[PDB]
Design an enzyme around this catalytic site. Structure first.
Site, mmCIF file in Angstrom:
data_model
loop_
_atom_site.group_PDB
_atom_site.id
_atom_site.type_symbol
_atom_site.label_atom_id
_atom_site.label_comp_id
_atom_site.label_asym_id
_atom_site.label_seq_id
_atom_site.Cartn_x
_atom_site.Cartn_y
_atom_site.Cartn_z
ATOM 1 N N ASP A 1 29.118 -4.866 -9.463
ATOM 2 C CA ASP A 1 28.917 -5.352 -10.149
ATOM 3 C C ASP A 1 26.917 -6.296 -9.784
ATOM 4 O OD1 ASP A 1 29.389 -8.797 -9.673
ATOM 5 O OD2 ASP A 1 29.835 -7.713 -11.802
ATOM 6 N N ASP B 1 31.706 -9.787 -6.752
ATOM 7 C CA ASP B 1 31.790 -11.286 -6.118
ATOM 8 C C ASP B 1 32.819 -12.211 -6.542
ATOM 9 O OD1 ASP B 1 29.142 -12.982 -6.819
ATOM 10 O OD2 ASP B 1 30.561 -11.737 -7.657
ATOM 11 N N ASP C 1 36.356 -8.538 -10.689
ATOM 12 C CA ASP C 1 35.810 -7.233 -9.842
ATOM 13 C C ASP C 1 37.569 -7.080 -8.521
ATOM 14 O OD1 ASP C 1 32.916 -7.367 -10.570
ATOM 15 O OD2 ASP C 1 32.381 -8.440 -9.018
HETATM 16 MG MG LIG Z 1 29.501 -11.159 -9.853
#
Ligand SMILES: [Mg+2]
Ligand SMILES: *[C@@H]1O[C@H](CO)[C@@H](O[C@@H]2O[C@H](CO)[C@@H](O)[C@H](O)[C@H]2NC(C)=O)[C@H](O)[C@H]1NC(C)=O
Ligand SMILES: CC(C)CCC[C@@H](C)[C@H]1CC[C@H]2[C@@H]3CC=C4C[C@@H](O)CC[C@]4(C)[C@H]3CC[C@]12C
Ligand SMILES: *[C@@H]1O[C@H](CO)[C@@H](O)[C@H](O)[C@H]1NC(C)=O
Ligand SMILES: [K+]
Ligand SMILES: [Tl+]
Ligand SMILES: [Tl+]
Lengths: 268, 992, 39
Positions: free
Chosen positions: B345, B686, B690
């Site tokens: 990410d 995070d 995700d």
């Molecule tokens: Mg992120």
């Protein structure tokens, strides 16, 4: 193939052949040096045989010899081992002044034939007649068990002195020259009868010390025949034969450390 | 099952408000009926998420109790009770042997079960985190009246109302809104507020303004909407199910464990039954044939090995806990070392997740600011009088403020009330000009025009802090081009000057460059109003232009971006040097995604996309050979119409990949694509978007401070300080533990041979038993334990970060080379050293090696209390047994003595001990404690009963010393050959 | 000696055990010292 190619299969064989060959050659080398440090006449250690064991001829199934008097093949098993032992004490086996000697027909003192050396031939052993074993096919009724003290090189079995009290209190106490053997069971439902050298219920000290198989082959150890002409029948009788001495001790674990454990039963 | 959920969603934002009501039998104004709502409740079911069915811990524990070694140990334990049963019936055996050994072995299985159970842990509460995002209550309009209801009682069709501060209770079709902004970071990973209005604004429902989603929150304003989806049927409720439902799967390390279990189990059953028949042929009673088998089992199975592995893993996880890297699953300690591809990410992972000033354009010059958290860069300018003029506008023409009580925390980390751009500017000036509040106190704001959608600028009028003036200063900021159309002069190095086409062109150049860097650019200008035309009491009208807004002085430009974390660029390069492929997978827009890719080193300098080639050469993209482009940037909207085979080609054909504007399922798809090619993949993230990717990853790593609860539930590892450098450490630790496990496994296995061989020679030679079953367990469960563990503290023999990731198909934890060395070479030398001491003990007590062959018959005969030794002496039963058990004790101690050398040689696979040294203090500890344990077991009174361990004479200890030394020399010579010729012979044969 | 060679069939297993246990303990202490050089 499985793993590799033929060329690789060969190389892995040539390696392990030389490798294991070397290892075998090294192992043997260390065995050589071990033997080189040892005597031919006497073992390095003797503390593990120290207190002599007492073993008998009747091959006990489990410290027991039960049979039927009114049956032939009921005791023919115990007569096999009994014969095996006494067959060795033949007179034809003890011929000439070599390597046997006529010793006192009465319990005598020790005999030192020098040291544990080869500086002399075969150390001459005392003769022993199976004919000293009175009364004892064997006892088809009321067995005639034969006792024996385990051989230990350089061991001098020392009898107890009549200083204080004794089990068989002072009776026929040949204090100086006899290692006594008194069998027991309270529970006194038997009839103990002992046979041996000089008519004594012990081991004549003139058969000691033992010089070992290498320095004394054909050597004969003293026997002590014991007969139980018990007037009882059809019951397990726990009879314990005990030897007494200064160098004799016992253990709760080793039930053969200078003593017997016989479970006779004339179930007839 | 979940293949449906891996697809992009379909919606009804295209319908009119009225049309949408027909579909759901609803009223736009009155809302649903109390009766109709309750009807729909029973129909569709609750607005809730149901957690997936889990496997109870019962079945999880017992599943370990039947994995190769445990199976063999079970066969042994029962076979003990078998022989015991056969005894208790036949001849009354007052002993406890088979009974107790059967109890001991069954305990070994249970305890070993706990270790593997501890290792195979799965702490997963994905669906629980999602459930936390549904509010307890919602506001609905029913029978023309608004009431709060249990949010679970919400159904498709009713009229819902939301306002700033509340969570979206369900997927809504916006029908009415007033200044409504929403935080869609759940779906995008981006927290910038998105406007919501009734008007449809994009074909894509995840981008349109007239849809609001469950799992997000309203940030400001008010909105009303019609519920289109409820519970599991919402967009993120499906993501929830997808994430929670995904099959976990076996880790690389787990697969390795099972693999050597098969090997060792194989040789165990082989030799087991190979000698079971070999005994019956020799005329051994089944009574004995089973007793030998039990011994064979115990000899072949390394009883303490699986627990060693677990402890070595645990100890490695403890070291990483001490670098702010939390491991939730013990096996994930190794996966990072086997990782060949990282899918990362961007926002909050690679980046700080905070709009930060990156560059400034003043004095006809581009200046760069420091974007790093801890400010690890340098200054750009302080001297220029122009800077102070620009700095003043950035502070004054700004409505952002620091939250109360932050004075303790660093400037860049403190919470700010305001939009991202104003916060960035605030923190920029506060950093390099001190307290901004001071500047806003020295220059009192009298009138302002806040940033307007139409004006595209924000202006402010302040009392000049200067005493000699104390007059009125005008400042404004806005779109760079709009600010330009309002300027006549430029503050160059202090003094103003006319805005000639020259500087105007340099402005465009500066503007295009900064924008090309993916940075948001703002214009800044001011104007000192004429004193005579503006008295100290002159009133300014903000509603109607009461003051000039043209012919102003352009001061400068400022650019900003959500920047990389300081450690990220360097960590990315380090991953790439270790041969790990790094891919970006983000919900963010392509221009931003691509710019950070270059910033952190995902896309290296000079590498082009097909679009780059086309623009440079000024040719159509179809005219470009796509193989000429090693880099690519894929938008999610295009990804959607590509098959997996085509996704596989993208993955194969590019070294530098950026997946931008991806949905959560799309992240999962990219991860699966990478895995499909046979790669071990890590995911770093995070956000809740995700979660599926993190779950599917061989190892998911979540950020600890910036991470959402969901992401950290989906992960195997948490970076508690958001230190991306930890990934680099993790992969390094992962590789090191992999090598050290080999060392520890070889060490443990090596001692199997000296435990097997005595039992074999017992049969083939008919000699007294050299070593007992109990004695074996004193080794594998006792002495070898701490030494085997200590190998986990071994330093690397070379630069492990310099090698490529292991090939999980070829590079195994236990291979033929390990067995050849442990079983065929070193263990064989240990066996002899054991036997030697055995022959020494017996020969020194009177039983010379020659007379031992074929004596076991009379030796074991309990009724022969007069066995003749070599010297003609007679032994009772218990007497010779004491010597025999003393043989077991010295054979045992011989193993310990030969394991000394083995421990030292297993220290290194390649290097010499003279190179690696002896700096492992745990290992040395192992040596001392191992020897202490052995001595204690031999000399402690009473151990001769409980373990049949007998006191050894001093000379006995030294029997195996020459064998211990040969091992050290042999292995040192062998490894000397390895190093001296990287060719292959010694290497390809023995190099673990 | 001659008939008084009882020492030939004797071993001080008691002292050996005392010494063996002393050694085991001291090796245990030494090990702790080296391990505790940093914990
Ligand atoms: Mg992120
Ligand atoms: C040791 O003495 C025993 C005494 O019983 C011998 O047994 C003789 O066996 C033969 C042939 O089987 C019989 O004819 C005799 O009746 C047995 N007794 C005697 C006194 O001769 C036995 O053969 C002898 N063993 C050896 C090796 O000489
Ligand atoms: C007690 C004694 C008699 C048993 C001796 C067993 C010997 C023959 C065994 C023990 C370990 C074995 C080796 C272990 C490892 C390998 C590597 C593999 O790729 C091919 C087989 C090979 C080379 C084995 C061949 C046979 C081997 C050398
Ligand atoms: C033993 O045998 C002798 C003959 O040799 C006999 O006189 C005696 O009665 C026997 N003794 C016993 C107790 O039976
Ligand atoms: K995972
Ligand atoms: Tl084992
Ligand atoms: Tl082992």
């Amino acid at each position: 193939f499985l793993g590799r190619t033929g060329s690789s299969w060969f190389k892995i064989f040539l390696f392990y052949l030389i490798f294991y060959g070397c290892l075998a050659g090294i192992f043997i080398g260390t065995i050589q040096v071990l033997l080189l440090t040892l005597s031919d006449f006497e073992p390095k250690y003797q503390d593990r045989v120290a207190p002599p064991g007492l073993s008998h001829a009747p091959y006990a199934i489990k410290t027991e010899i039960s049979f039927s008097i009114s049956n032939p093949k009921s005791y023919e098993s115990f007569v096999k081992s009994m014969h095996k032992l006494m067959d060795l004490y033949n007179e034809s086996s003890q011929a000439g002044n070599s390597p046997f000697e006529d010793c006192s027909d009465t319990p005598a003192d020790y005999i030192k034939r020098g040291d544990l050396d080869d500086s002399q031939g075969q150390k001459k052993a005392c003769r022993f007649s199976r004919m000293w074993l009175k009364n004892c096919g064997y006892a088809e009724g009321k067995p005639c068990v034969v006792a024996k003290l385990n051989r230990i090189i350089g061991f001098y079995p020392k009898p107890l002195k009549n200083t204080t009290d004794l089990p068989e209190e002072l009776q026929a106490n040949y204090n100086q020259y006899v290692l006594p053997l008194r069998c027991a069971a309270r529970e006194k439902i038997g009839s103990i009868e002992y046979f041996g050298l000089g008519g004594y219920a012990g081991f004549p000290l003139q058969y000691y010390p033992y010089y070992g198989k290498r320095l004394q082959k054909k050597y004969l150890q003293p026997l002590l025949a014991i007969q139980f002409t018990n007037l009882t029948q059809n019951m397990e009788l726990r009879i314990e034969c005990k030897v007494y001495g200064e160098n004799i001790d016992y253990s709760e674990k080793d039930r053969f450390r200078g003593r017997f454990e016989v479970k006779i039963e004339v179930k007839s | 099952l979940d293949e449906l959920k891996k697809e992009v969603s379909m919606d009804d934002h295209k319908l009119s408000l009225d049309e949408l009501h027909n579909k759901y039998g609803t009223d736009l104004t009155r809302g649903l009926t109390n009766a109709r709502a309750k009807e729909i409740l029973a129909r569709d079911g609750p607005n809730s998420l149901t957690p997936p069915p889990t496997t109870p811990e019962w079945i999880k524990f017992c599943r370990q109790l039947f994995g190769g070694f445990s199976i063999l140990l079970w066969i042994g334990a029962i076979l003990c009770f078998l022989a015991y049963g056969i005894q208790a019936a036949t001849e009354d055996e007052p002993a406890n042997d088979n009974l107790y050994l059967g109890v001991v072995l069954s305990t070994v299985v249970i305890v070993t079960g706990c270790f593997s159970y501890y290792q195979e842990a799965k702490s997963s509460r994905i669906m629980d985190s999602f459930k936390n995002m549904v509010p307890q209550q919602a506001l609905v309009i029913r029978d023309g009246e608004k009431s709060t209801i249990n949010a679970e009682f919400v159904v498709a069709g009713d009229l819902v109302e939301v306002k700033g501060g509340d969570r979206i209770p369900a997927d809504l079709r916006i029908i009415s809104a007033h200044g409504c902004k929403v935080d869609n970071s759940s779906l995008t990973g981006e927290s910038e507020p998105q406007t919501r209005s009734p008007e449809f604004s994009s074909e894509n429902p995840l981008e349109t303004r007239n849809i609001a989603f469950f799992s997000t929150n309203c940030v400001e304003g008010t909105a009303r909407g019609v519920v289109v989806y409820t519970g599991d049927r919402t967009v993120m409720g499906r993501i929830a199910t997808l994430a929670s439902g995904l099959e976990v799967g076996r880790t690389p390390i787990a697969i390795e464990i099972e693999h050597f279990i098969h090997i060792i189990t194989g040789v165990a059953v082989f030799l087991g039954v190979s000698f079971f028949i070999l005994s019956l042929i020799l005329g051994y009673s089944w009574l004995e044939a089973v007793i030998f088998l039990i011994g064979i089992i115990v000899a072949n199975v390394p009883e303490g090995l699986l627990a060693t592995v677990t402890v070595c893993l645990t100890l490695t996880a403890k070291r990483m806990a001490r670098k702010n890297c939390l491991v939730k699953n013990l096996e994930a300690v190794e996966t990072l070392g086997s990782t060949s591809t990282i899918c990362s990410d961007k926002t909050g992972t690679l980046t700080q997740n905070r709009m930060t000033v990156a560059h400034m354009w003043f004095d006809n010059q581009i200046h760069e600011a420091d974007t790093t958290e801890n400010q690890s860069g340098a200054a750009f300018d302080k001297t220029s009088a122009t800077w102070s003029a620009l700095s003043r506008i950035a502070a004054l023409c700004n409505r952002a403020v620091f939250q109360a009580g932050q004075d303790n925390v660093p400037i860049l980390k403190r919470s700010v009330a305001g939009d991202a751009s104003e916060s960035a500017l605030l923190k920029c000036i506060e950093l390099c000009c001190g307290s901004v509040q001071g500047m806003r106190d020295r220059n009192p704001k009298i009138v302002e025009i806040p940033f307007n959608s139409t004006n595209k600028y924000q202006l402010s009028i302040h009392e000049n802090e200067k005493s000699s003036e104390s007059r009125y200063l005008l400042v404004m900021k806005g779109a760079p081009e709009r600010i330009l159309d309002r300027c006549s002069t430029i503050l160059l190095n202090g003094a103003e000057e006319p805005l000639k086409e020259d500087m105007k062109e340099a402005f465009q150049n500066a503007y295009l460059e900064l924008g090309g860097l993916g940075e948001r650019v703002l214009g800044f200008c001011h104007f000192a109003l004429p004193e005579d035309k503006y008295n100290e009491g002159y009133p300014f009208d903000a509603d109607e232009p009461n003051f000039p807004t043209t012919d102003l002085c352009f001061v400068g430009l400022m650019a900003m971006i959500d920047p990389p974390r300081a450690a990220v660029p360097d960590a990315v390069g380090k991953c790439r040097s270790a041969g790990i492929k790094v891919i970006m997978v983000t919900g963010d827009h392509p221009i931003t995604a691509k710019a950070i890719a270059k910033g952190v080193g995902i896309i290296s300098e000079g590498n082009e996309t097909i679009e780059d080639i086309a623009a440079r050469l000024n040719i159509p993209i179809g005219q470009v050979n796509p193989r000429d482009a090693k880099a690519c940037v894929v938008h999610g909207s295009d990804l959607k119409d590509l098959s997996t085979e085509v996704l596989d080609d993208i993955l194969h054909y590019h070294t530098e990949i950026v997946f931008a504007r991806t949905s959560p399922q799309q992240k999962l798809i990219i991860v699966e694509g990478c895995q499909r090619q046979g790669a071990i993949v890590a995911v770093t993230g995070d956000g809740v978007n995700d979660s599926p990717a993190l779950k599917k990853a061989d190892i998911g790593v979540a950020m600890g401070i910036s991470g959402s609860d969901v992401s950290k539930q989906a992960a195997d590892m948490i970076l508690l300080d958001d230190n991306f450098a930890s990934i680099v450490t993790g992969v390094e630790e992962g590789r090191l533990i992999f090598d050290n496990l080999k060392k520890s496994i070889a060490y443990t296995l090596t001692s199997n041979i000296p435990e097997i061989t005595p039992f074999l020679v017992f049969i083939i030679g008919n000699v007294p038993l050299p070593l007992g079953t109990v004695t074996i367990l004193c080794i594998d469960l006792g002495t070898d334990m701490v030494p085997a563990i200590s190998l986990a503290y071994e330093q690397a023999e070379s630069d492990i970060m310099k090698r490529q990731p292991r090939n999980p198909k070829t590079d195994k934890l236990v291979n033929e080379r390990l067995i050849s060395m442990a079983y065929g070479q070193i263990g064989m030398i240990q066996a002899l050293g054991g036997f030697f001491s055995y022959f020494v003990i017996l020969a020194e007590n009177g039983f010379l090696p020659m007379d031992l062959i074929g004596k076991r018959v009379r030796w074991d005969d309990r009724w022969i209390s007069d066995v003749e030794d070599s010297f003609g002496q007679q032994w009772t039963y218990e007497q010779r047994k004491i010597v025999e058990f003393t043989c077991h004790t010295s054979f045992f101690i011989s193993i310990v003595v030969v394991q000394w050398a083995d421990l030292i040689i297993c220290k290194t696979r390649r290097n010499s001990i003279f190179q690696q040294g002896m700096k492992n203090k745990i290992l040395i500890f192992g040596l001392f404690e191992e020897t202490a344990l052995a001595a204690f077991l031999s000399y402690c009174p009473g151990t001769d009963v409980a373990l049949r361990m007998y006191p050894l004479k001093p000379s006995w200890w030294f029997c195996a010393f020459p064998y211990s030394l040969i091992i050290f020399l042999y292995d040192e010579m062998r490894r000397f050959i390895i190093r001296r010729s990287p060719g292959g012979w010694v290497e390809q044969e023995t190099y673990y | 000696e001659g008939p008084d060679n009882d020492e030939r069939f004797t071993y001080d297993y008691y002292r050996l055990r005392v010494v063996g246990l002393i050694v085991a303990a001291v090796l245990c202490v030494i090990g702790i010292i080296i391990l505790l050089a940093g914990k």
